[model samples]
Target: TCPFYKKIPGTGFTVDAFQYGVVEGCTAYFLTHFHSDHYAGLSKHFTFPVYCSEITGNLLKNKLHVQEQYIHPLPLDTECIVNGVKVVLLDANHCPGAVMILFYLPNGTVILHTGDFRADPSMERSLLADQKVHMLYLDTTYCSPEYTFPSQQEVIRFAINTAFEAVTLNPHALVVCGTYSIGKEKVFLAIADVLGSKVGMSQEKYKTLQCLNIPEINSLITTDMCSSLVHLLPMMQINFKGLQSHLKKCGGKYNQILAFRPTGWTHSNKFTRIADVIPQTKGNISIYGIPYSEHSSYLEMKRFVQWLKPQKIIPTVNVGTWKSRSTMEKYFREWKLEAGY
Candidate 1:
């Protein structure tokens, strides 16, 4: 029902859409990750089986209460036969369990579907090894010249260091770092390790971290805002406006409040923006906008395209008219013309 899907010729197989990809007559179904938009309208009572990384499937059952019968978890680098094509899942470097999908078609063609992801050392080495991609389903979330930030690890390190700096400067300050439910686990754990203490979180987030079974980030559930000097909260709850509003409610419980936003949005103004190693202060509060993000920037997108040299490219985030094919067509002219990927 959406342009976010691809259908096979004469086989009736679809990828990433619910209209026909959800067991009405689907040959197979695949989930890139548990992002709300990626797997929209899905439930535990789904009629079709969904394939994804092990952690992703675990989150489905544990967090979302999805049934196990419809879940097929695949380990990274393992290949599975689906709809008569060999499909392999690799780390997408986007979120905790996000993956990059590859489909080996029967006619010796390879289609690489890069779910929401940014390029990392592991990704850069593995993606170009022993494969020729004939087509590509790209994330293209930041495939414009406007988005050029630092590397994921670099940005993460800056965020972690800046966070520790904030606490060191003011011991009584409450340092709250922003992150998504399934992303930026590394950042939280780093802060905990730096502080030589456990991270404070909501009960639900504590359970999620426990299920991931990571030892570095010792998570403790606490409703009290004064339980710890550093608190890791969801990114949505601590956006500039959100954090401002939240600290107002905290009142005078803490001497000072420092919020960190680990996002790429801060670099929107400059084409060659540099990542800051320190927090930027505004008013009585201080916030650090780290260049950390899950999607590839324009530079990474270009590198990926040039290396793969796909005959046809498809931008997953784009949509054309309803009930018809994408106006971008086989070459993805509309996407390339605008983003110049």
Candidate 2:
């Protein structure tokens, strides 16, 4: 939990779930988002009363099978009291149901935990006033200077266009896109709408989307995408293991197999970040790793910290070594961010 939970000074309440990524030991427990990285340790037996977005609560109940009584919904921008502390939730813009959790301590200090998110317009508005954020738990996944990628919208535009163009190039091919069950749904729905295709997802995958309760997604969940022209695969399939088998069995009856994996890691090589698609060959399958990520780019994080100027910025993930810490600190210094506001 060293890298997970941060204690709220002078108050028993704390934000985020970190007892295995979620636990209860403070006055109350607050969840910032439903990403597996944020809730990695959550089990089906989790019984803690968690304050989170309605979509997050539904995900815990529907996908994780948690008891409904234990899930508490915190509507966006709404004020609520938990364990004698006033709280406000803001959009994190990382994904659907993602949120920036704000704890208004009785001490008049505001503690903000930005679970995992991009700096979207609504979120930008929330942070502009310098809510006097006392402590900021940050998502530093791509918080390096080398990660100055284009905006998510631009990347998605490139991806959607590539999907359409790829299909146009190979009409009989099955287009598979890599994503988590709940994440990257925008791309999923966009591709579906643009291609005039329903886009197939396994029943299990559809269950995760159901938690969000989007009518466009619900009315189109078809368990039988076995014969579909395009299908959505969970991130687990990014390696194309089963896909290779299918490519071989389809035996050229399927003209081409175009796979797209939207991720920021595509540009870790010696090059500036940009929105584009890189095609890869794995045995018989054709895969394209699209540069689409939810994490704030290096520039995005730089602007964010420069504005908020939190007294402390504890990185949420991926700093487990001496060199890693040095690199992250160097990046922070480059942004001219002092220890605190």
Candidate 3:
């Protein structure tokens, strides 16, 4: 049952079915991206052929390990009909396989769903020049004013500089950073591109890179290819103490140690404590603060709303609570607009 909206008494609406099957009898179901929230529910119940970009299809198949039969892959801006609904897939420059969907209804109403996107000027230009949108379903994960993030380029540069400094200071130490298996490829590529011949990837990362079909500008080195550098595979568990001790063991014969980790600091108090203890764990341990986020910030969302100028804005993700809904309403009111469901 929906928390906000009341359902008819005898509708037979289970939570799962209501959440996944609300749009039944529609011409087609369009998947905007490969994010868990957007695509996870479809696997169990949405038997209608799912439509998405080619990159998103590859990501679903290669990275997320979804079955191929469930996907109908199309290139960006390509139109396709599923169950008689016209859908177009557009590039959403948030992550490697992210996409936005434009649904053209039979009634001449075009609804645009930006699954997760950033303020990439190229993407903005593309979206702006294409078909005008009537309604927009936006990804409002970071819709509040308190959330501020640096640009992606700046974050990449910071990571590269920090890693370079650490490597230059201690040449023989092993550096390990934790990143999502699929999302942080750009950061890894940036580090490799900057370090050039000094950096190496773990065997797992190498295998991941081999599976990448898209264009990558960096040349990566792995443990098997380079004897001078050692790459540490990522571990799922947050065993910071054990990780530090293992790094210390590896750094015993080497001069420098570097590692990249996901932003566990924001989500876990225990990881935050472990981050604080890094200095004591190893003298060479350097935690690089690179803010590489998959979601857009508050200002970016506002800018997107302005650019789209849709008749109604519906925040489908991350604004489901009453407090958040009220706050978002206030934001829209301030912008001389109204929020829609």
Candidate 4:
């Protein structure tokens, strides 16, 4: 049974439910990462004990200006007691500061909450790998079998190769990358590295990246527009009209434009492979829709469910109703049954 609230059944804690203000019976709030959806209600005016990873804590303080007194940064892998419950943070592999929260209750009940993760084989070595988990709060963004897509490494290689080919053909071609306030840093960084060009982004985004402290990418970020051919724009700006504005605004600096719209929605099950998902082009401008998802695929989620085999599964995303949540539970049941768990 799923509770209407994001609150865990008996933990007196809530996961990424700040938008609801202080939830009834929930004493502490846990932020999985710095994503806007997760930290929407958190601000200087709000008063609550917020727990998250150290990097996420820095982002909240710097980006959102949340007070440090209410922020608590937890160490990864190591167990820390939080109001009598043992908690640990594991890298979610979704973003720079994203993590999956693990809880160990006093009664020996174990729970794992995957806060938007792209599961890899390395997860077999996780602390919960061999243990029996009572409950698993999953990121069920792609809970169906139709959501299968290529690995992140494969997508990265494709993006780099395609961008390189386009740029080589025309040195003055402007490569625009679609990105958010956070996430999708790898795509642009790789393109800039291979092209040997600095990444042009807004000063606000540059400040956010500075908080990430990625040494290699740090040197590549610049606010100067003319200094680099590769420019980062919001995901909403990846359309043809958006590119047209940049082309006209730039005067004659760039002859043609190449845009990369990297996200999970770009991929479709109808396509046999990543390359089969064609890039749309109209004369001098082109947009490549890559299946560069930060969340785990259908197969990846199935594999993880089989491995963990938790007693109960809670669909975190797309769980507004029992009907939608039941769809994810169907897949989970099939996975556990297939694994003979």
Candidate 5:
């Protein structure tokens, strides 16, 4: 009963009351990635056969632990048919479980939905090779000129240097770095590799890292193998003051402790509050604000559009009615192309 609509506008889908009156006959939904903004709304609205990458399904089932019978997991680059719509998932390179969806219609109308991708070399190669896309749905969160992100390697280097500096300056202080469980793990690993010792992670964080199954870069030890390094567990109940006090006590036993804050502290507004809470001590507590973003930068987005040369481009997860649409239009126009829905 879910597949009800014949044609929805190329602009976007509008949902109402967990069931939109339009698109009455639409039975299948293709999920681009496992990010909350992209997948949160689907639970209450639709129960049809949901399509996504296999890794994404595993992440949802293991991390979020969502159970649904309609989840249809497909491997990357594999084409599948759902309600007569041919779909293929490509590597997003945003995270270990992220993916981009490309939908192909019978009439040769192809829609490329890049779900929070970055302009990493691997990701760029994947998009460039897929030459059949006619329309592009991009992530324009940082489309403004002021937003610039450094490469992953550069961010890792900065974070490692900053953390090491904090340790050297304060022999008995805690260093807490905030990052997500999946993508940020790579940064943490890089730090460990540079130090030639594994940084301790909490049991929960260790479990998350194991799920990703990343190959060791330089034989960096993990918490399971070493006990001298201290791992800071997330403090859900304790305030910053409480956390700082707790860290001070543990400072005597371990030379340094590394704590990683979980997601939801990206935007400058939220991060400003976090910056205010850094504990003042004789030993410096360094805060590494490295740009290890999953999403693409403005230049990356522009390069993607230029390479694809799509007829039209669309954007998702906009703040609201704003200049992003027009800005993207101008980007395409500057390249001497038509911009439309």
Candidate 6:
């Protein structure tokens, strides 16, 4: 049920299934992004030709150690012929190097694979228009109604405002943002910008940030943690137990620690206002779990699907269980009917 099928329907290309070893009918492998889950089975030795965005290609070679000979970087929003099929790559808006793959088959069928995306209102105008998409491979990560969170911008503003207040109340307090190696960068980066503080992170994480091509972020990082009052830590280190470990490790360098745990998991259907979400404080550390997310909300996904009016949908996530897949498809069916197609 998970990951659906590796090969796109009626196409020779494989996508985000490198973890499954060599695909049976894969003509060219297309990587949607650098997220480990999508590119899991890829290794330095794997020799199949791979297609991706320029930024994703850089990451593949730099981080994954894949050979440059096999990596083909495609320009965004440009039509290119690969393996006798017309293909286009468009920005995904999920992560920096992520993209959605658009395929035009010989039989005049158009397929769109949203390899993890946040549905924007402008996609209908910018992505495609007046063309009937035969098939859509969707990112159903937050496909349920219970999963809708606030807009990314709204949540980021909340984090920045919260940080401003915390630092204003305690000027010398250490500001730590919990995030992955990539993703949720806006949250911590904005916090740093608002406070005019340098970011402290490990050498490896810093190198990954360099690959991101954010020029200003280069000057904003310091390898030495003591020099900067603000720090960037992995999600595991933001919890009460983990924060205790970090406090002991720091050994009272900064007495008060104000951390932000920006994630979608903290949001619930019960909360009306985004500000209703609160922080938990224990001793010198306070962790605010905000409702910031990169994936589209349930309504957003509905709108995207309704606009496209795709004839068929093959989900790419939350398909591991029968009930989960059934419920998600039920919603999809509802949306399709609502679209009157």
In order, how many clashes per candidate? 0, 5, 9, 0, 10, 1
Candidate 2 minimal-lDDT segment of 10 residues: 268-277
RMSD of 1: 4.5
Each prediction's whole-model lDDT (CA): 0.68, 0.71, 0.59, 0.84, 0.57, 0.83
| Native RMSD of candidate 3 (Å) | 6.0
Q: Compute the lDDT of residue 71 as modeled in candidate 4.
A: 93
- In candidate 1, stretches whose alpha carbon ends up further than 4 angstroms from where it belongs are 8-13, 19-24, 213-227, 239-253, 267-283, 318-341
Task: Look at candidate 2 and give me any clashing residue pairs.
Answer: 17-21, 17-22, 19-22, 20-41, 311-340
Instruction: Work out the TM-score per prediction.
Output: 0.82, 0.87, 0.77, 0.95, 0.74, 0.95
Candidate 3 wrongly placed segments (more than 4 Å) = 1-27, 41-48, 63-69, 197-211, 216-239, 248-255, 262-282, 337-341
Q: How do all the candidates rank in terms of lDDT, highest first?
A: 4, 6, 2, 1, 3, 5
Q: Across residues 1-341, which tens digit of lDDT does each residue of candidate 4 receive?
A: 21453666668888888876457787888999988888888887767889999889999889888999999999898889887788989999998889998888778888898988998778879786767789888898888777888888888998899899989989989999988768878999999999999999888888898888577665788999888999988889899898999889887999999999887754364566877666789989999888778898888888878878788887888887788778877777788888887
Candidate 5 ranges with C-alpha deviation above 4 Å: 1-23, 41-47, 121-124, 127-130, 165-174, 216-243, 249-251, 255-283, 337-341
Off by over 4 Å in 4: 1-5, 321-323
Evaluated at residue 201, the lDDT of candidate 3 is 50
lDDT of 3 by residue, 1-341 (tens): 24322111122211112244565333334556555655655543345555667766666566656677777778776677655556666777676667776767777778777777765546667644677788777777777776666666766777777667767776765556565445656666667666664335566555555554656424454555344353544544224564566665553666555666645124333244322323223465555444567777777777667766777777766565799888887887676544331
- Compared with the true structure, what per-residue lDDT tens digits does model 5 show for residues 1-341? 22212122342322111233334444555666665655654543345566677766766566665565766788887777666566677888787767777777667788777767775555556634756667676677777655665566755666667566656666554554454335656666665555555656565666565655467622553555334243434445133554556566564654544444433224552334322434323342323334466677777777667667777666654535557667656666775444332
lDDT of 2 by residue, 272-316 (tens): 444434677865477766666677877777878877777677777
Q: Residue 315 of candidate 6: its Cα lDDT?
A: 90
- Clashing pairs for predicted structure model 5, backbone only: 3-24, 3-25, 3-26, 3-27, 4-24, 4-25, 4-26, 5-23, 5-24, 5-25
Which portions of model 2 miss their true places by more than 4 Å?
1-5, 18-25, 127-130, 239-241, 248-253, 268-276, 282-284, 337-341
